[PDB]
Amino acid sequence: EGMWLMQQLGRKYAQMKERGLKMKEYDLYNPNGTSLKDAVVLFDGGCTGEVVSDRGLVLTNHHCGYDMIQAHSTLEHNYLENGFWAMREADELPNKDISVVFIDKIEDVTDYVKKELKAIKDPNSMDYLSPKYLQKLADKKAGKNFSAKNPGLSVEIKAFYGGNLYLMFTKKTYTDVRLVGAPPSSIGKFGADTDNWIWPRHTGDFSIFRIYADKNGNPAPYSEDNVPLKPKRFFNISLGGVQENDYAMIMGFPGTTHRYFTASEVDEWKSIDNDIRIRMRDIRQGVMLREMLADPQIKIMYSAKYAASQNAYKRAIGANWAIKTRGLRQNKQAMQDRLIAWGAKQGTPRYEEAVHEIDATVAKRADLRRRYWMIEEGIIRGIEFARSPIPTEDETKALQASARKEAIDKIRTRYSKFANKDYSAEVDKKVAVAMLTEYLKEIPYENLPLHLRLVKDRFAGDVQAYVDDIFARSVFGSEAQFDAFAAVPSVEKLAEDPMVLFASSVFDEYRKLYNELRPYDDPILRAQRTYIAGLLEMDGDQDQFPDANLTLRFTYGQVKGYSPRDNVYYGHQTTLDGVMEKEDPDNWEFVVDPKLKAVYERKDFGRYADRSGRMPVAFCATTHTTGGNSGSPVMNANGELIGLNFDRNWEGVGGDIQYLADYQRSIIVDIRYVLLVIDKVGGCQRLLDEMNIVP
Amino acid sequence: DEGMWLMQQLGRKYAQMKERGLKMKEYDLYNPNGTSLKDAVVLFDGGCTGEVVSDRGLVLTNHHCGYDMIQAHSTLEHNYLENGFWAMREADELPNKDISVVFIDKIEDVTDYVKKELKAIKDPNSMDYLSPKYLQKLADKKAGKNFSAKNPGLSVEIKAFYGGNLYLMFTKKTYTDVRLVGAPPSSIGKFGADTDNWIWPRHTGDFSIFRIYADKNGNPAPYSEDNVPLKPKRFFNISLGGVQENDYAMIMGFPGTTHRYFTASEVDEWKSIDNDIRIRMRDIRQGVMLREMLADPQIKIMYSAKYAASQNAYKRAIGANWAIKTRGLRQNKQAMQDRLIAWGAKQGTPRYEEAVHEIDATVAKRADLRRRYWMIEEGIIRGIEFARSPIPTEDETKALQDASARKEAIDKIRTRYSKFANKDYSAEVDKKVAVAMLTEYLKEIPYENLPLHLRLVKDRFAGDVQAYVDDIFARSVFGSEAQFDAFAAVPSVEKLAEDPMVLFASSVFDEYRKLYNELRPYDDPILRAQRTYIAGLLEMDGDQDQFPDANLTLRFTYGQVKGYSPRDNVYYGHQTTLDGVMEKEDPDNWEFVVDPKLKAVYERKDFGRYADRSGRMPVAFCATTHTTGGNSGSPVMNANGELIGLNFDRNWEGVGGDIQYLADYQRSIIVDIRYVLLVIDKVGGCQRLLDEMNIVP
Numbered sequence A: 001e002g003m004w005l006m007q008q009l010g011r012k013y014a015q016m017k018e019r020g021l022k023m024k025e026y027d028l029y030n031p032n033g034t035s036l037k038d039a040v041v042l043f044d045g046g047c048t049g050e051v052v053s054d055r056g057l058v059l060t061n062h063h064c065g066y067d068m069i070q071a072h073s074t075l076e077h078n079y080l081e082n083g084f085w086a087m088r089e090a091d092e093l094p095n096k097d098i099s100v101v102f103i104d105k106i107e108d109v110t111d112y113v114k115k116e117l118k119a120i121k122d123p124n125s126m127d128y129l130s131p132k133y134l135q136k137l138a139d140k141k142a143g144k145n146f147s148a149k150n151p152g153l154s155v156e157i158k159a160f161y162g163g164n165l166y167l168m169f170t171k172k173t174y175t176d177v178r179l180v181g182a183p184p185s186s187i188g189k190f191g192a193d194t195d196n197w198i199w200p201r202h203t204g205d206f207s208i209f210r211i212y213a214d215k216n217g218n219p220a221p222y223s224e225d226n227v228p229l230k231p232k233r234f235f236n237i238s239l240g241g242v243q244e245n246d247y248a249m250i251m252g253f254p255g256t257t258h259r260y261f262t263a264s265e266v267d268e269w270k271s272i273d274n275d276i277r278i279r280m281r282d283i284r285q286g287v288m289l290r291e292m293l294a295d296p297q298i299k300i301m302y303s304a305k306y307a308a309s310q311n312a313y314k315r316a317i318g319a320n321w322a323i324k325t326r327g328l329r330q331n332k333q334a335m336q337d338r339l340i341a342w343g344a345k346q347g348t349p350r351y352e353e354a355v356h357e358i359d360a361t362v363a364k365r366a367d368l369r370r371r372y373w374m375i376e377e378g379i380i381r382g383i384e385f386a387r388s389p390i391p392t393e394d395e396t397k398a399l400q401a402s403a404r405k406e407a408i409d410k411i412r413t414r415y416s417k418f419a420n421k422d423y424s425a426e427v428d429k430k431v432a433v434a435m436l437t438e439y440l441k442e443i444p445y446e447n448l449p450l451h452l453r454l455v456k457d458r459f460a461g462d463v464q465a466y467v468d469d470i471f472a473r474s475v476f477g478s479e480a481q482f483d484a485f486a487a488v489p490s491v492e493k494l495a496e497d498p499m500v501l502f503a504s505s506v507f508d509e510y511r512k513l514y515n516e517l518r519p520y521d522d523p524i525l526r527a528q529r530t531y532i533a534g535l536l537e538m539d540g541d542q543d544q545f546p547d548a549n550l551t552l553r554f555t556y557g558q559v560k561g562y563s564p565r566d567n568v569y570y571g572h573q574t575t576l577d578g579v580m581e582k583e584d585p586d587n588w589e590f591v592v593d594p595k596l597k598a599v600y601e602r603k604d605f606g607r608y609a610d611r612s613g614r615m616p617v618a619f620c621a622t623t624h625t626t627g628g629n630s631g632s633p634v635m636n637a638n639g640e641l642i643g644l645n646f647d648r649n650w651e652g653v654g655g656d657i658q659y660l661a662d663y664q665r666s667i668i669v670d671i672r673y674v675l676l677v678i679d680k681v682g683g684c685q686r687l688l689d690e691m692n693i694v695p
Numbered sequence B: 001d002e003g004m005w006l007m008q009q010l011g012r013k014y015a016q017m018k019e020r021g022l023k024m025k026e027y028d029l030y031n032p033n034g035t036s037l038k039d040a041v042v043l044f045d046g047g048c049t050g051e052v053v054s055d056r057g058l059v060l061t062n063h064h065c066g067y068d069m070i071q072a073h074s075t076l077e078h079n080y081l082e083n084g085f086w087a088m089r090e091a092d093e094l095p096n097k098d099i100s101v102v103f104i105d106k107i108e109d110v111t112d113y114v115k116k117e118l119k120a121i122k123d124p125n126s127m128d129y130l131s132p133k134y135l136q137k138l139a140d141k142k143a144g145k146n147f148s149a150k151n152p153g154l155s156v157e158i159k160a161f162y163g164g165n166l167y168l169m170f171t172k173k174t175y176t177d178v179r180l181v182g183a184p185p186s187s188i189g190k191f192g193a194d195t196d197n198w199i200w201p202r203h204t205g206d207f208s209i210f211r212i213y214a215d216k217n218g219n220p221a222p223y224s225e226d227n228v229p230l231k232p233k234r235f236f237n238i239s240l241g242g243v244q245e246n247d248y249a250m251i252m253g254f255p256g257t258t259h260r261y262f263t264a265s266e267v268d269e270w271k272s273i274d275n276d277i278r279i280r281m282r283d284i285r286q287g288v289m290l291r292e293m294l295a296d297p298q299i300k301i302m303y304s305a306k307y308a309a310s311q312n313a314y315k316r317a318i319g320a321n322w323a324i325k326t327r328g329l330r331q332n333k334q335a336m337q338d339r340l341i342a343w344g345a346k347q348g349t350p351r352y353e354e355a356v357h358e359i360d361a362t363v364a365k366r367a368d369l370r371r372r373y374w375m376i377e378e379g380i381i382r383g384i385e386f387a388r389s390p391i392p393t394e395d396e397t398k399a400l401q402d403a404s405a406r407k408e409a410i411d412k413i414r415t416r417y418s419k420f421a422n423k424d425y426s427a428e429v430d431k432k433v434a435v436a437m438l439t440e441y442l443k444e445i446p447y448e449n450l451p452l453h454l455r456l457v458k459d460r461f462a463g464d465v466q467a468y469v470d471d472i473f474a475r476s477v478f479g480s481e482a483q484f485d486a487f488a489a490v491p492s493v494e495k496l497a498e499d500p501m502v503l504f505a506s507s508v509f510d511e512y513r514k515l516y517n518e519l520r521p522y523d524d525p526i527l528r529a530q531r532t533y534i535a536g537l538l539e540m541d542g543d544q545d546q547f548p549d550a551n552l553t554l555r556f557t558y559g560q561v562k563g564y565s566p567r568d569n570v571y572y573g574h575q576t577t578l579d580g581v582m583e584k585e586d587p588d589n590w591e592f593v594v595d596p597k598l599k600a601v602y603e604r605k606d607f608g609r610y611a612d613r614s615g616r617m618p619v620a621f622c623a624t625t626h627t628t629g630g631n632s633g634s635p636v637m638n639a640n641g642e643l644i645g646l647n648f649d650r651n652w653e654g655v656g657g658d659i660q661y662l663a664d665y666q667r668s669i670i671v672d673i674r675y676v677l678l679v680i681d682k683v684g685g686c687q688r689l690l691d692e693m694n695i696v697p
């Protein structure tokens, strides 16, 4: 059910032991010694990774190492499509702008932060959640020269439980992290977008890196003199596999949850955030798919834009399914009513006042928040010409020195990036006509961005004519129109440009709405501090976890499938047979790697197949994970690595607000399949040899 | 494999059925010389199965079987199709024109008689052994002089089985006064609608209720207000015990057709010609049609039924090709024929190998013609609406070339034009469909094999399909209403003789008929070789584990209530519940609307004695019985012969079962009788129907 702080391991240990945990408490997490926690890393700021050898080898997801695989790929050596396997340490590829963060120490600094906060004066101050303020407190506690006296180390204080608990983390960061191995994209991203958020899943979502450091194992930026890191702890790899009901646990960095939402915040999330995103993206995606299916060149240009829009669209569909069917609103209402009844009994009305302040703030910002999501989903992300070039003040104060050419060259560079090889003005006009038709029926005239008022005033309500006119008269409507402007440029032409006026007007409204909505966050945050303090005082900091905030957490559960609907059961494990069932050579998402297909045909599974001779691929577990948990190590009852977390099923996305025991699962790539791909597909035996593989 | 057995084969299957769970006595299920459960089974309206469930002739069948009768009695004032129908008294039951129920009174093996009559051979290659006319002459000869007059209501029919190796005579009793008694609303009767056709899990309450009426003596009589309900020989008891996983289940019904004795070459032909062409052509047609329906809500209304009708056999072909590709259907037919050939070599009889060779040679020889036939049939005859545009008859052309018979010819042509260009026809949608269909057709069929008018695409239009189609509509008399009216005001034979649409329609129908006539002679050598082939199979392995192909005659099948795994890590259980109906509810989707009375029953848990042991309300179940088209409405029986459900569909994964039964995938989709009774009781409130049924605890 939760994403527990490392400090909460002591209080959870007995329950974990009753669920199957066999390892000693301090072997998993020791606040003053080496433990399994020391083999977990925050991979590239948004993923989790794990050290799997005494030479700093790191496993994470293929989708986590994707940018590094792509940055090293060329037409001659396409690692993204063919995979990459460095046959020697010297062949491992360095990566610019990469990092791995170890959580060296964690300390509870609540009394210290609360004492420092008493010197504020203004009771409404938001310094208690300010990264700048908390960094000043972290530096004060660590010392005036901490990072100089302790190289590679840094400190950070974060708020938890809405400002009721504070932890200081001592972090060790390594920036020389080299690409060692990756399967082809046909394996690493087998389901591609079709299987995103889907269980059963048959994706071998892994990539391999190596942490490099100086001669003493201290962090150092990329240098050809750097040597692999010998870590204080690494995971042993299990080949025992998994069975239904086996204990499983994860450590990682879940990013965000909303476990303490009021019922009114659940209603807002559904009726505003999700409904608008669903409605607007369904319109955008429908026009886009029609255009992609009718023209193969449009499919090439718009496939990535279409897929990027679909990802959070599917999340919102899954989240709204939970709100509708799992009683998320009702369970938050029961949570707050129980606190209000307990506060009425104790004679402390501040908890009821806090819930009331949240409800009143949610009700007061409704129209503004609806207008913000409507413009953001409808125009800012919905219409490409909304991000067309807007001349800066320096560019207008140049067109009217002979740096008129410099202003035109900068405008041209931005025009060329807007109207790039993937941009179709015809597709964009069709998307804009459908998106603006919806937007204009939902946003009244008095609330419209100034230029959109011309639809009724100048174009007699004809959206098509308004959009046609923007392209026909704009200097960014075509290359010939831009070149005619660039030959005879005037600031008066740019000031009256229909596309410039549209883009400026919709961005002005988007910013005005953002600025009007920002003050509503603070009373909710302050009321949440009181609300969560009451919840903790009433039911204890034992069965209610603090919201995720990109800090190290542990979660435990079992290897278990679930029933998605009446008479349908999805088991706990997928096999290589499922990959072969999904094979479609004329569908780029479901192409099967020939070497992998050969391994399946010959049954060349070695020591990696199960007791029945079937080759496992992935499994699912009742662990509680969210975004940020991609690449997380999945452990046995003995703490051995049995897989990597890489996704979660759409039925469980509502789990960020309320865990769903009968539907929510972490989607994990079986470590046996990872080893089979390294061995039989990559042929990289040296990586198997450096790992500690246990029978 | 797990067959559709003749009633005669019950004796030799009985011990296996008992070991699989059957508890009833053999003669209580089927007795050739007395009353048995077989007497409660009817052929409902020529293509469905039904069953008698009361001593007052009450009959249960599927909602999709009684659909036309429910629709024919529906009006804007009393929409029975939408709201359901529940006659609260026998006098309120609605008569139906052109309806029938057929009882199988007697079945007799007449093989020796037919084979003796056949020996009077004028031609060894004669097809009289399969001729309905010839076999009816033999049936009439055996039954006697004026049998129908001497035994009113009874009729005699002889059918060939096992490719002409076994013959049965059926004495049938037909009743034509069959009245509508009850039906759930369409929201229950066709809950999944087209989306869930061929799908398991299934949540559809596919049932309707009729009543057989007869004269004072229980003898067949056409509709008369003097008719009284039939007191039948036998009726099914209704069980409320339900089903559990692995329970024995059996069905009786009228499966229409199977191809259990196809050679490996016939499986290859079915895949590479029949199925691949139907799949490719319908995918093109459906794709254009769906794009047009999604862009214009008026096009969606006009083309929804045409789109759904095309999709039904398209899905079947996808399911059949999945079995050919993944379940080794070709390989298992090859093993079947190789085993017979090896046995024939040892018996010193080469006629079985010669028979398989004749089938292979005939299949190989007709390949190009059969490919051309399926290409024109799927591509144009079915694919393009203007292919069925009006073609002036020889008498209509003669009438237009000096009498008032000209105005009569124009009125007849106008009537046919008005039926072609009806309220659901869009010339714009049709031109778009034709351009895509003809582009694929012209790519596959060479110039020398094209229907004469299609040669104009290359010769006159420089390969521009769009221009050829545009020209047909721009210049044709049937291209628009204004163009027809201009023709009708000044009609000439010469205008019709040169009409581009008339020439297209005539040309494609001429080619379709020429191909049909060239292909017809190839059927006979295959049929004659199949008689020898199946005779060998029967002599070698016996008429015990190989059932005769279905031929719309009464058969029984047995199996168990069991789910299956459709793919890696996915299991579909044996039973669906009312919960599943509620999960699928979508008020803004006509297919998934939930009846408010049913939704209330679910919320209040007003399940009475119809819910299972755990308090869950069952809806449907699936079984390993072997069924096919014709089995819709079939009674599903317990180990004790009590009614536990009605068969209504089969999953797409098992459609290949018409050639080879698929034990791990093929299932009959059945509506639980507990759900049928729940709907009659709590939705219809028709207590009198429950009271007249014999419901056992």
Ligand SMILES: O=C(Nc1ccccc1)Nc1cccnc1
Residues within 6 Å of the ligand: A193, A196, A303, A304, A305, A307, A308, A311
């Ligand atoms: O961009 C994506 N796919 C893609 C890329 C190029 C071409 C075609 C498809 N997927 C994606 C996006 C955002 C979140 N998750 C997955």
Ligand SMILES: O=C(Nc1ccccc1)Nc1cccnc1
Residues within 6 Å of the ligand: B194, B197, B304, B305, B306, B308, B309, B312
């Ligand atoms: O015609 C059908 N459905 C339909 C009718 C009217 C409007 C919309 C849909 N279904 C169908 C089912 C089975 C075989 N053939 C056709």
Ligand SMILES: [Cl-]
Residues within 6 Å of the ligand: A038, A102, A230, A231, A232, A233
């Ligand atoms: Cl370390």
Ligand SMILES: [Cl-]
Residues within 6 Å of the ligand: B348, B349, B350, B351, B352
């Ligand atoms: Cl012979």
Ligand SMILES: [Cl-]
Residues within 6 Å of the ligand: B327, B661, B662, B663, B664, B665
């Ligand atoms: Cl099978």
